[model samples]
Target: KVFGRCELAAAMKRHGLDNYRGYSLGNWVCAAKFESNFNTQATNRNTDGSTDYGILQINSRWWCNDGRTPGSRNLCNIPCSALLSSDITASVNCAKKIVSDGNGMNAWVAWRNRCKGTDVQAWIRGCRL
Candidate 1:
């Protein structure tokens, strides 16, 4: 599903992403905006043969096991396909693990470039939450 900005924000907040690992919900929402445009099924293939999957684009190289990457670390202990669901429960859980593992939100280059130094709160400006 393609979520609108506030819709995504509200969902993320409900999932306890508001201040996860010192990154605000807006930061997470902004990262999702750039990484996948809030599309639950988004996928991107890297030049290195690894794939990024789902809304937060958890990668096959380290976070997920896609069965195609040379050495799948599977740090999130989840199948890559699990990230594609619109339910977003698995994706949210995995994202929490990603940041808690010390990667922080910077694990997503999109976040580093777009949200790192920006006013991320504006990303959810229209949301009541």
Candidate 2:
């Protein structure tokens, strides 16, 4: 559960995502902050018969494999449970691919809904990362 706002930014910095592909690390941090509160184990069941998994709340419908969700693209080719772990390697890797899509950060509802139209600097307000 690394979503300490500052911690999220620091880690994002470590991940070298501060501003990859025109999307800022602060923005991603903001997305993850509101997405799962940085709890790797976080999950949510949607009325659409899909589940969101992990810190980024990746949808089983388009990202990872939950084995039960229908029409999953499974672009990550990894189990949904892998994202539910503290190690974010799979999550981050999948996230990069997700962001590379034409949707960009829009793949994440959290980014579109919450990280939109804001400076997002507050996400790393006090961090040096």
Please report the candidate that would top lDDT against the real structure.
1
* Residues 1-129 of candidate 1: C-alpha lDDT, one tens digit per residue: 999999889888889888988888889999999999899999999999999999999899998998999966898888999999988888999999988876688788899988899998899887888
Give the root-mean-square deviation of each candidate in angstroms: 1.0, 1.3
Assess candidate 2 and give its lDDT: 0.83
Q: How close is candidate 1 to the true structure, as a TM-score?
A: 0.95
Please list the C-alpha lDDT of all candidates, in the order they appear: 0.90, 0.83
lDDT of 2 by residue, 1-129 (tens): 555677767766677777877888878888888889888889999999999988888889988888898776798899999988877777788888888989889888878988988999877787876
Lowest summed lDDT window (length 10), candidate 2: 1-10
Q: In candidate 1, what residue range of length 10 has the lowest lDDT sum? A: 98-107
Superposition error at 47 for model 1 (Å) = 1.4
Flag regions of model 1 displaced more than 4 Å.
Answer: none
